[PDB]
């Protein structure tokens, strides 16, 4: 790798990046031809670090997009994308994060399907702390800076559905509605609502296409956005009356109700999807460890919201949570017992649907 | 000569449905129309002979030819109502009466008034037309008139449409048998009186319009009326088929003594009556005319006045019971209608001739012109058809031989004629025989015994004997026998 570094030192930054990308392409192709599992060495990492103005950055991004579109072999694409953007615990991660965000925004702008699927694959094997930042950057770029740019994100549905599911998962993980600033954007609410309602299978394509051989690592994103969508539907009204526009509030409430119904239907068909795969009653896409924090924060919001003034809001939130839990545990997605459900719901406020769900 | 054959059969008593006024029978319609015709023919064609024969089953002639139209005009309103129609009998009777009265040369128009109903059979028009054309025999169809006739059929049966339903081909075939000379007349319209009046006016204008003319003798002029209207003539049907009529302006060209013209072959004797253009006697009677002077001069002097009607067509304007008038004739068109007058284009004034051919004492006469080649009866031809002719000739030649030597020249000429005929006809035995009888008469010579007579007969006999050989000694035609000196 010393000769490659020496040769590329006589070229400009963009040209050096292009030839080192080509060299990594051929090296990884040879490695995969020799062995099924190629080991990522520190040599490519440092070459990308010391080889890969606004005009120069735009030219480099365009060259990267052209290179990604030209090559047709997916394994090299994914491996090189990971080696370029996988965090290394160094100070250069921020520059890598910014470059990745700009590249993904450009790919969404010009519909670069290979780049979108590379981002989806890398984001699947990335800690959530970087995924939420990338989602935040994309949401800004396509919802706040340029008005009307969300229509560019509209067309991504027919290009890379896995990227759509991953983006939904990332934005649900980030926008946890724990604060007013963390409330999901109204445009983003329409955006995800249209994505999910156009294709109910969109939030389940990742589970179907991913070979399940081991549990997801702690701190990584969930297989499906079902937990995030359920949380959005449950605590979304609570944050809405915590922030207290009547028309926007009514539209948001209708959106959240429709999204909750679609999530229940998705869980209903996910029962079948776990059925043919022989994962019914064995693998749970909705982990038990996630319901405890949401229940605790529901209780905190209910105590803070003066239930005498927001009895209807608390009743609606508890009804939505009870419906979500009933559909999850009836579909086999939530592997839990009724005693455990009773234990976690003891501190929750009284709600006839919740008590009926607890009793069963 | 006009014969008004009016049908009187029951078919013309059928009333017509004329709008507005009362119903008229077709007989009354014919009566009114023929009344118009007779009034016109009496007022402007008064010199015309006319007759009115009525036919049905049998034809009868009520009024014969007459110039008094107050007889015929009343003869129309006193008619009977016979039944049955027989056109053939009427045509036969018309032929018979015209032949009996006028002859076979005078023109005779036939104004027939039919009804278009024809007949039903036997004597009907259909039966005779369909049969007698291919039958003829003694009862030959009389439609081909034996004289320059004119068959005008006035079929007063509505328009052509009414007679096209049943029978009009029969009528227009009937006209055809007259060599196509005639005209079928049909009343176009709803039998109104005006329409039949116009129909009869059409007939009048076609036929009974007097022929006016101007009579010019150099510069002297006169306005005349030639009655009858001259018939157009045709030279032939091979080299000149277009008929020729006389010109309107009859020009006098010369005057020929009545003795020199003899009696020329004329075409039709025509009167020439001056026409002005008691008022007539009190105005036109006193105004000096030219026809009166011409007629008076011609009658007093006794001459004619050669006229030139059309190119290569001349005539003559002579004079004249006790009544007299200036009647003009017409010659046969051609270069020389009169053979004994020479080509009429070669007759000129006596001034251009050297002397006066007529003579100072009016004794000599240029006419008649001798023919270029003499005929046979004027010449001396030798015919021998009957044996009587040859016997007469031989008796004459023998008798004149006895008179020798007195009429030697006549005997020699007769013998020359006899031998000329003999070698012309090649009947040589006759020449031998006449030699033999000359010898026989020599044997029977009288006791006078004239010396010269014997020598002449012996020489003649020897000439005939040598010519009877047939050799070219005296066989030449011009080798006339010459008596001995």
């Amino acid at each position: 790798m010393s000769d490659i570094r020496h040769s590329l030192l006589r070229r400009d930054a963009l040209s050096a990046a292009k030839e080192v990308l080509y060299h990594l392409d051929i090296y990884f192709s040879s490695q995969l031809q020799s062995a099924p599992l190629p080991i990522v060495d520190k040599g490519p990492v440092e070459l990308l670090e010391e080889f890969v103005n606004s005009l120069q950055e735009l030219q480099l991004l365009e060259i990267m997009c052209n290179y990604f579109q030209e090559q047709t072999k997916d394994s090299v694409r994914q491996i090189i994308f990971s080696s370029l953007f996988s965090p290394q615990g160094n100070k250069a991660d921020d520059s890598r994060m910014s470059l990745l965000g700009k590249l993904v925004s450009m790919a969404v702008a010009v519909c670069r399907i290979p780049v979108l699927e590379c981002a989806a694959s890398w984001l699947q094997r990335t800690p959530v702390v970087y995924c939420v930042r990338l989602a935040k950057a994309l949401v800004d770029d396509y919802c706040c800076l340029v008005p009307g740019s969300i229509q560019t994100l509209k067309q991504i549905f027919s290009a890379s559905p896995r990227f759509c599911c991953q983006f939904i998962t990332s934005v649900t993980a980030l926008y946890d509605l724990s604060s007013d600033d963390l409330i999901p954007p109204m445009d983003l609410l329409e955006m995800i609502v249209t994505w999910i309602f156009e294709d109910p299978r969109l939030i389940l394509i990742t589970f179907l296409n991913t070979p399940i051989a081991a549990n997801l690592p702690i701190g990584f994103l969930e297989l499906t956005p079902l937990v995030g969508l359920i949380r959005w539907c449950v605590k979304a009204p609570l944050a809405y009356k915590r922030k207290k526009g009547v028309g926007m509030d009514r539209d948001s409430h209708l959106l959240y109700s429709k999204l909750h119904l679609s999530v229940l239907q998705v869980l209903m068909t996910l029962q079948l999807h776990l059925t043919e795969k022989n994962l019914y009653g064995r693998l749970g896409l909705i982990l038990f460890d996630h319901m405890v924090p949401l229940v605790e924060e529901i209780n905190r919001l209910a105590d803070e919201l003066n239930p005498l003034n927001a009895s209807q809001e608390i009743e609606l939130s508890l009804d939505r949570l009870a419906q979500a839990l009933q559909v999850a545990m009836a579909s086999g997605a939530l592997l839990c017992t009724r005693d455990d459900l009773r234990t976690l719901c003891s501190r929750l406020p009284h709600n006839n649907l919740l008590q009926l769900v607890i009793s069963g | 000569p006009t014969v008004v054959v009016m049908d009187v059969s029951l078919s013309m008593t059928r009333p017509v449905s004329i709008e507005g006024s009362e119903e008229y029978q077709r007989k009354h319609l014919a009566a009114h129309g023929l009344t118009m015709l007779f009034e016109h023919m009496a007022t402007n064609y008064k010199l015309e002979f006319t007759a009115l024969v009525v036919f049905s089953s049998l034809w009868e002639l009520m009024v014969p030819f007459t110039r008094d139209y107050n007889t015929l005009q009343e003869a129309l309103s006193n008619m009977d109502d016979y039944d049955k129609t027989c056109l053939e009998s009427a045509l036969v009777g018309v032929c018979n009466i015209v032949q009996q009265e006028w002859g076979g040369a005078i023109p005779c128009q036939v104004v027939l008034v039919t009804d278009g109903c024809l007949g039903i059979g036997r004597g009907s028009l259909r039966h005779s037309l369909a049969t007698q054309n291919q039958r003829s025999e003694s009862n030959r169809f009389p439609l081909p008139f034996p004289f320059p006739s004119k068959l005008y059929i006035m079929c007063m049966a509505n328009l052509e449409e009414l007679q096209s339903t049943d029978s009009l081909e029969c009528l227009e075939r009937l006209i055809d048998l007259n060599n196509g000379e005639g005209q079928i007349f049909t009343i176009d319209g709803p039998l109104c009186l005006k329409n039949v009046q116009s129909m009869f006016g059409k007939l009048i204008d076609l036929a009974y319009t007097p022929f006016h003319a101007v009579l010019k003798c150099g510069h002297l002029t006169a306005d005349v009326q030639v009655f009858p209207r001259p018939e157009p003539f045709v030279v032939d049907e091979e080299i000149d088929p277009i008929p020729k009529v006389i010109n309107t302006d009859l020009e006098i060209v010369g005057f020929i003594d009545i003795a020199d013209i003899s009696s020329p072959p004329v075409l039709s004797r025509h009167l020439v009556l001056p026409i002005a253009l008691n008022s007539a006697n009190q105005i036109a009677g006193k105004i000096p005319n030219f026809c009166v002077l011409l007629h008076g001069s011609l009658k007093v002097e006794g001459m004619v006045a050669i006229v030139q009607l059309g190119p290569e067509w001349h005539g003559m304007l002579y004079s004249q019971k006790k009544k007299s008038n200036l009647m003009m004739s017409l010659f046969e068109p051609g270069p020389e209608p009169l053979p004994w007058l020479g080509k009429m284009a070669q007759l000129g004034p006596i001034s251009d001739a050297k002397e006066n051919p007529y003579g100072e004492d009016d004794n000599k006469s240029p006419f008649p012109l001798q023919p270029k080649n003499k005929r046979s009866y004027a010449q001396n031809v030798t015919v021998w058809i009957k044996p009587s002719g040859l016997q007469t000739d031989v008796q004459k030649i023998l008798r004149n031989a006895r008179k020798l030597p007195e009429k030697t020249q006549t005997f020699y000429k007769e013998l020359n004629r006899l031998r000329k005929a003999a070698l012309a006809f090649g009947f040589l035995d006759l020449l031998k025989g006449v030699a033999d009888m000359l010898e026989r008469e020599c044997t029977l010579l009288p006791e006078t015994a004239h010396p010269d007579a014997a020598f002449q007969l012996t020489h003649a006999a020897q000439q005939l004997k040598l010519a009877s050989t047939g050799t070219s000694e005296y066989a030449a035609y011009d080798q006339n026998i010459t008596p001995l000196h």
């Binding site: - | 000569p1 006028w102 002859g103 034996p146 150099g218 510069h219 002297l220 009858p228 091979e238 080299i239 006098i252 010369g254 020929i256 004329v266 009167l271 009677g285 105004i287 000096p288 030219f290 009166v292 002077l293 008076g296 001069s297 007093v300 002097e301 006794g302 050669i306 007299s324 008038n325 200036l326 007058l341 020479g342 007759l347 000129g348 004034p349 006596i350 001034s351 251009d352 001739a353 051919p357 008649p368 080649n373 003499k374 009866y377 031809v381 015919v383 058809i385 002719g389 016997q391 007469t392 000739d393 031989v394 008796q395 090649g426 009947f427 035995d429 025989g433 009888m437 026989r440 035609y477």
Partner: protein, 517 residues
């Protein structure tokens, strides 16, 4: 029909073989007044020639013009004896031609030749054009196609059998077809449209008729076989006589009651349309000068059938002497009158039936009939002066202008009537004897010097009479009469001024000598 009919061309042919040389067994008695010689019989050829010549004599006597006839003896050679020009279709020339032909040779070569040469020559001669045909063709320019050349051929021969008759029938049909084909391409040869054929046969009497009579048979639309058969002598003459009567639609007449026997005349049939097979007419009393201008509707020439017999000779001589003969048809009615106009006896046809122009209107009641002062005698003189005369010498007018004498007569007529008053009282100049020579001489085309002297003398004594104040005809003072007659004379001479310069001279002399107030 027209001039060019089927009778226009008659082409006689005659047998000349030695077979047609024996006598006809009809010996005659030409010996009338010892022991007479043996009776003599005419030969077959002589009889045929004689009968043909009688036919042609009748031909020429009745139809001098527009009917020609040929003569083709059929011998070892084929001779045409006369052409088609009118100057050669004459009787005496035919006599000369037959005389030069000579009697048939008895024993020269009997079987060497037959009459087929005669027939082929006849069909050859018949196709030519007559002088009249040529004149008609020249007159009718660019359309001289409607002139038929139809003719007629006549044969006299002694046929052996009917097989021979059919043989030469086929021969003549073939040769007429060939002649038509040959004349189709040529120009100076017409195409026969109808050649009627007659094939008379003759035989001595006492011999059987080897050929029976055959009716009309059309072997072609251009031929009509009408083969006859009759004995020689008188029978053949009668047959040719009825032939000449039939061909030209002739007719017979039988004038009788002749003061002194009957006589027979042949003329055109149209003379007998008044009567409507020999009509019999009677000689009627010839009045000298009863009437002079008869009404003759037809003038048809006549020809005696016995021109050398005593009755016909007497009748024709009396007619030629000048007087006519008024016949009458069988209470009596006047009819056909004979006449002799220069030596061609005519048979005029009168009209005994009622004339349709009977009782003409009186000339005393027509326009102008009430005037009794017409210059009838003067117009009689005018008629006599302007009489016509025949001109056999056509002269030239100015330069190549062959003046028509009829136009000369018309011009003289116009000149003589430039001033012709109709009534005596109208004029005064013409009534005076003094100006009569001037009136007679002034109308002439060109007055001579003697004419000038005469007119000068006439005006001289006219002025003398003016001076003497003599009483002029009344025709209002004496001076008025003088001035009016002077005006009339000056009007008369003025209208003739353009006639000649001498007329201008006499007019100027009159003006100089006029006593104009």
């Amino acid at each position: 029909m027209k001039i060019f009919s089927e009778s226009h061309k008659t082409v006689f042919v005659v047998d000349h073989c030695p077979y047609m040389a024996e006598s006809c067994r009809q010996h005659v008695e030409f010996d009338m007044l010892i022991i007479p010689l043996a009776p003599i019989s005419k030969s077959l050829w002589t009889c045929s020639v004689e009968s043909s010549m009688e036919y042609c004599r009748i031909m020429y006597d009745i139809f001098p013009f527009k009917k020609l006839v040929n003569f083709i003896v059929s011998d070892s050679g084929a001779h045409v004896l006369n052409s088609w020009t009118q100057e050669d279709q004459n009787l005496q020339e035919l006599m000369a031609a037959l005389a030069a032909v000579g009697p048939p040779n008895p024993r020269a070569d009997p079987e060497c030749c037959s009459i087929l040469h005669g027939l082929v020559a006849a069909v050859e001669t018949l196709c030519k054009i007559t002088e009249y045909q040529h004149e008609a063709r020249t007159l009718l320019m660019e359309n001289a196609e409607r002139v038929g050349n139809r003719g007629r051929i006549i044969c006299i021969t002694n046929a052996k059998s009917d097989s021979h008759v059919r043989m030469l029938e086929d021969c003549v049909q073939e040769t007429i077809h060939e002649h038509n084909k040959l004349a189709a391409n040529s120009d100076h040869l017409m195409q026969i449209q109808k050649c009627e054929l007659v094939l008379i046969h003759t035989y001595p009497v006492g011999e059987d008729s080897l050929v029976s009579d055959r009716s009309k048979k059309e072997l072609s639309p251009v031929l009509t076989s009408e083969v006859h058969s009759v004995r020689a002598g008188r029978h053949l003459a009668t047959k040719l006589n009825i032939l000449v009567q039939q061909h030209f639609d002739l007719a017979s007449t039988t004038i009788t009651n002749i003061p002194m026997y009957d006589v027979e005349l042949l003329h055109h049939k149209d003379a007998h349309v008044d009567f409507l097979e020999t009509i019999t007419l009677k000689w009627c009393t010839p009045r000298t000068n009863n009437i002079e201008l008869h009404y003759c509707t037809g003038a048809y020439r006549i020809s005696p059938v016995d021109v050398n017999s005593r009755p016909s000779s007497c009748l024709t001589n009396f007619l030629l002497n000048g007087r006519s003969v008024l016949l009458e048809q069988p209470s009596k009615v006047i009819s056909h009158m004979l006449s002799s106009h220069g030596g061609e006896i005519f048979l005029h046809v009168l009209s005994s039936s009622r004339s349709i122009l009977e009782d003409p209107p009186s000339i005393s009641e027509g326009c102008g009939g009430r005037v009794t002062d017409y210059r009838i005698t003067d117009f009689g003189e005018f008629m006599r002066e302007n009489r016509l005369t025949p001109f056999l010498d056509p002269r030239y007018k100015i330069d190549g202008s062959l003046e028509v004498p009829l136009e000369r007569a018309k011009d003289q007529l116009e000149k003589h009537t430039r001033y012709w008053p109709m009534i005596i009282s109208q004029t005064t100049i013409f009534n005076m004897q003094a100006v009569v020579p001037l009136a007679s001489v002034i109308v002439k085309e060109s007055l001579t010097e003697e004419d000038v002297l005469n007119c000068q003398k006439t005006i001289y004594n006219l002025v003398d009479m003016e001076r003497k104040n003599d009483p002029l005809p009344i025709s209002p003072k004496r001076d008025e009469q003088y001035r009016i007659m002077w005006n009339e004379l000056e009007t008369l001479v003025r209208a003739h001024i353009n006639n000649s310069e001498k007329h201008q001279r006499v007019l100027e002399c009159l003006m100089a000598c006029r006593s104009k107030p």
